[PDB]
Amino acid sequence: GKVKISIDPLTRVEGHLKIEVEVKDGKVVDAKCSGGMFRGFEQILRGRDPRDSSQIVQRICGVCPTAHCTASVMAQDDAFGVKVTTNGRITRNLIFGANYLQSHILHFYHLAALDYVKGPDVSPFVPRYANADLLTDRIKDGAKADATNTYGLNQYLKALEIRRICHEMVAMFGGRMPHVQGMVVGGATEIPTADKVAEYAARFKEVQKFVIEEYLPLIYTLGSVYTDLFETGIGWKNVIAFGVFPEDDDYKTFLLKPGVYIDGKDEEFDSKLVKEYVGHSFFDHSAPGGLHYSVGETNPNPDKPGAYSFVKAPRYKDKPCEVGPLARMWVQNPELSPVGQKLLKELYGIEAKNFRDLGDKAFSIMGRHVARAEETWLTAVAVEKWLKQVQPGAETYVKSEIPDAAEGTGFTEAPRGALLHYLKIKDKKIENYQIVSATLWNANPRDDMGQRGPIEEALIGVPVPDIKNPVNVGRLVRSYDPXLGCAVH
Amino acid sequence: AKKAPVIWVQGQGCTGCSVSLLNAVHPRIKEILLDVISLEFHPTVMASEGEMALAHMYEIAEKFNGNFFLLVEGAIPTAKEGRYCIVGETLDAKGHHHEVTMMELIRDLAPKSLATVAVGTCSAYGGIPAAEGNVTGSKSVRDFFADEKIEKLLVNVPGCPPHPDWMVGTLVAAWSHVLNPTEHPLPELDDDGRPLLFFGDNIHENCPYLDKYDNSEFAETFTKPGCKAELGCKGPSTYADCAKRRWNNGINWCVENAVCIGCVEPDFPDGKSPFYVAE
Ligand code: SF4
Ligand code: SF4
Ligand code: SF4
Ligand code: FCO
Numbered sequence: 001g002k003v004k005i006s007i008d009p010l011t012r013v014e015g016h017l018k019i020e021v022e023v024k025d026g027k028v029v030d031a032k033c034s035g036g037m038f039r040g041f042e043q044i045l046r047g048r049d050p051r052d053s054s055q056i057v058q059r060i061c062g063v064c065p066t067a068h069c070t071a072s073v074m075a076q077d078d079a080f081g082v083k084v085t086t087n088g089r090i091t092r093n094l095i096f097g098a099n100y101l102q103s104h105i106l107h108f109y110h111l112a113a114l115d116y117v118k119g120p121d122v123s124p125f126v127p128r129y130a131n132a133d134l135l136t137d138r139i140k141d142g143a144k145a146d147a148t149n150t151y152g153l154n155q156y157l158k159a160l161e162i163r164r165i166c167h168e169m170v171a172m173f174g175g176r177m178p179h180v181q182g183m184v185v186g187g188a189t190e191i192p193t194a195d196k197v198a199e200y201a202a203r204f205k206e207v208q209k210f211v212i213e214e215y216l217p218l219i220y221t222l223g224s225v226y227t228d229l230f231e232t233g234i235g236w237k238n239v240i241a242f243g244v245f246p247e248d249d250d251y252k253t254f255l256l257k258p259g260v261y262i263d264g265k266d267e268e269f270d271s272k273l274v275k276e277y278v279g280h281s282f283f284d285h286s287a288p289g290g291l292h293y294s295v296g297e298t299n300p301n302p303d304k305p306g307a308y309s310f311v312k313a314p315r316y317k318d319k320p321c322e323v324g325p326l327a328r329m330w331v332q333n334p335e336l337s338p339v340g341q342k343l344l345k346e347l348y349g350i351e352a353k354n355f356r357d358l359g360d361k362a363f364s365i366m367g368r369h370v371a372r373a374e375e376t377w378l379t380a381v382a383v384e385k386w387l388k389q390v391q392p393g394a395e396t397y398v399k400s401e402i403p404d405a406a407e408g409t410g411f412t413e414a415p416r417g418a419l420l421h422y423l424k425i426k427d428k429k430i431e432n433y434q435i436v437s438a439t440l441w442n443a444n445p446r447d448d449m450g451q452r453g454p455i456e457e458a459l460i461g462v463p464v465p466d467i468k469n470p471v472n473v474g475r476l477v478r479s480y481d482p483x484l485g486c487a488v489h
Numbered sequence: 490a491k492k493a494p495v496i497w498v499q500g501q502g503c504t505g506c507s508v509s510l511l512n513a514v515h516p517r518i519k520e521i522l523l524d525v526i527s528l529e530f531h532p533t534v535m536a537s538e539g540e541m542a543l544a545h546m547y548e549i550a551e552k553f554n555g556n557f558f559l560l561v562e563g564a565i566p567t568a569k570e571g572r573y574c575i576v577g578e579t580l581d582a583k584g585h586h587h588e589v590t591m592m593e594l595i596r597d598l599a600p601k602s603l604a605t606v607a608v609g610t611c612s613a614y615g616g617i618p619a620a621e622g623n624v625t626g627s628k629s630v631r632d633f634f635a636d637e638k639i640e641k642l643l644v645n646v647p648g649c650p651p652h653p654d655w656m657v658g659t660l661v662a663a664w665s666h667v668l669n670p671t672e673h674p675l676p677e678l679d680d681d682g683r684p685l686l687f688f689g690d691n692i693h694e695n696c697p698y699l700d701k702y703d704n705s706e707f708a709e710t711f712t713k714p715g716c717k718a719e720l721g722c723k724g725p726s727t728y729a730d731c732a733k734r735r736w737n738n739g740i741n742w743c744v745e746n747a748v749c750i751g752c753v754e755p756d757f758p759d760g761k762s763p764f765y766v767a768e
């Protein structure tokens with residue numbers, strides 16, 4: 001009684017994604033995730049001035065270029081042997097933090113929300129699934145359905161301007177966005193002035209107001225209508241985080257700390273235990289067993305028998321692990337926003353102080369959206385603090401020279417999850433450059449041992465009561481905020 | 490009255506051209522989508538997915554044959570029979586599945602279009618995906634049209650990403666021409682098919698640091714005063730109106746902040762590299 005559903009393109013994600021599911025007895029029973037576009041940045045980078053990498057890598061993705069730039073300049077800082085100043089560190093955090101806000105807002109509204117909100121009857125809001133299970137379908141009181149849908153749609157429209165203001169914030173010290181100019185090996189290229197700090201702050205307060213007063217309330221309200229969506233899209237329940245937004249000059253402390261949670265147990269993150277498999281990916285490895293990124297290889301092969309994706313398969317201690325706001329928020333376990341504490345009580349009858357108080361509900365379609373909204377608020381609190389810490393006039397740049405021979409690794413968290421860039425230099429040129437990106441951890445295919453990637457595994461059990469309108473498949477996938485440009489590079 | 494129909498397709502792109510478009514002002518993106526264009530297909534933002542999305546795209550390309558703009562973001566990879574970019578799957582009338590490559594998609598849609606607009610340096614000129622070291626046979630729209638012997642009006646709007654003003658301005662000028670060709674002639678293009686309206690000015694000739702350049706006052710590092718030439722600035726060899734227009738609603742621009750990397754030019758990135766070595 002199995003039925004196959006194939007969705008290509010899976011739209012309202014970044015980049016080129018195909019999802020295939022098998023459905024039996026009203027639920028997904030198997031799944032395959034495929035990235036269908038490859039550029040090969042790791043090949044393109046070879047032989048270049050290593051400093052060029054922080055411009056080239058941003059073109060992996062125009063949604064999260066600041067994450068790649070951050071990882072690249074940190075890898076360069078490490079390889080070149082240069083220490084960034086206090087003001088350089090803070091300025092880099094302000095550039096990048098502004099895009100965290102942009103990316104999460106862009107995601108929830110402009111990628112995710114059309115699975116819940118009925119837009120106007122003009123393209124690109126139509127056509128849509130005939131039975132889309134939207135707010136206007138779910139809420140049986142018609143006036144309430146209309147009012148809640150309009151509330152959501154007006155936020156979607158307002159968010160177009162809020163995300164644009166976030167890019168004004170990125171450009172303030174970043175030069176422009178997409179694709180900043182302001183982060184380089186040795187720090188940042190423009191010292192913040194008192195006037196520009198104030199101009200960033202004024203814009204930031206408008207974004208922050210939207211986050212607290214509109215975005216958080218919408219998410220908790222949405223979850224209170226779709227309570228079933230906290231009970232599916234579960235997956236492996238293994239998460240990893242690398243640390244993001246260093247809060248001191250020796251990179252020992254972060255806004256969101258590194259860590260791993262596997263099979264119900266917390267452990268420290270050890271980068272030695274990351275490796276990539278390619279058994280079901282369009283790549284050749286020179287040796288079996290999966291490769292640590294420091295000896296990673298990028299030899300594309302679209303003819304490889306049995307392969308189905310351009311995404312490699314990263315594993316931690318041979319376990320699939322997911323990444324992103326759910327991962328970071330689970331690992332750090334921060335206190336919830338005042339809005340979240342209040343609305344969880346009022347709308348759900350849940351007493352919750354810290355993220356982990358959500359329990360099982362965290363590992364679900366709606367849990368991923370909640371984690372992302374809460375993290376947006378948490379990041380805003382941090383940006384508010386950094387705006388007080390930044391010192392007008394204080395040097396943000398330290399000179400360096402390209403080394404003959406060196407290696408460096410930059411670790412961070414992109415808005416979608418754990419990110420590292422590994423850089424090896426020989427004869428003052430890029431000898432190897434290896435990128436292990438966020439969506440790479442989420443949207444990967446099976447490894448050599450047949451273990452499904454996190455999105456593949458989380459699809460198992462997702463209800464599909466209507467095969468012609470399989471709305472929960474896309475809802476699950478989009479809850480991960482996938483970026484296939486990043487996943488494949 | 491009537492909006493410009495747009496089918497926006499992505500090949501080897503990063504979505505940055507789309508994101509830059511979302512940053513438009515005067516008009517902003519809400520007004521663009523509701524009043525200026527009918528964005529019929531766009532993989533990043535459209536409601537429908539899979540079969541429904543593709544069927545809608547092909548329906549519009551038929552109903553609006555010779556009367557829609559094909560917007561292309563990203564390069565077209567030709568190696569391995571186009572298999573480095575699969576843009577969707579079409580389910581025939583018998584249940585069998587067929588993947589569609591970027592090559593196949595562009596070959597199909599370009600002859601149906603009123604005009605093709607290659608937005609971004611990737612689609613216009615090849616850009617980063619076509620740079621040295623790539624193995625995907627990555628190609629620009631103009632080169633793919635030449636190889637395919639496709640004669641279709643083509644306008645390039647380069648930049649990595651292009652400024653939203655360049656994309657909106659070019660599309661509005663094209664649509665105005667279609668609606669009244671003698672009142673609104675097509676924008677004059679340079680030898681690389683990009684509008685002189687936006688790409689006629691040399692950055693360096695129009696740069697506010699030119700007085701410093703002339704006095705040999707060069708910034709020793711990024712955070713010192715002076716012209717940026719010694720830090721790698723490619724303004725001397727780059728043609729765009731960034732010095733006047735600036736970026737992100739006039740907030741900053743590359744040269745004030747750091748250096749121009751020549752992102753609009755047909756030889757970006759290789760002819761502009763290394764970025765932090767002077768020209
Ligand atoms: S031109 Fe630049 S910003 Fe646009 S798709 Fe290409 S890499 Fe991305
Ligand atoms: S080299 Fe660059 S900074 Fe100097 S005057 Fe020319 S465009 Fe301006
Ligand atoms: S200043 Fe140079 S690098 Fe910046 S957008 Fe203009 S052409 Fe591109
Ligand atoms: N966020 C983001 Fe992009 C992804 N996945 C990166 O890194």
Ligand SMILES: [Ca+2]
Pocket residue numbers: 302572
């Ligand atoms: Ca194949």
Ligand SMILES: [Ca+2]
Pocket residue numbers: 042312434435436437489
């Ligand atoms: Ca990689």
Ligand SMILES: [Ca+2]
Pocket residue numbers: 637638639
């Ligand atoms: Ca032909």
Ligand SMILES: [Cl-]
Pocket residue numbers: 512513514653654736737738739
């Ligand atoms: Cl702008």
Ligand code: NI
Pocket residue numbers: 014060061062063064065483485486
């Ligand atoms: Ni991305």
Ligand SMILES: [S]
Pocket residue numbers: 063064065066067068096099100103414415
């Ligand atoms: S980012």
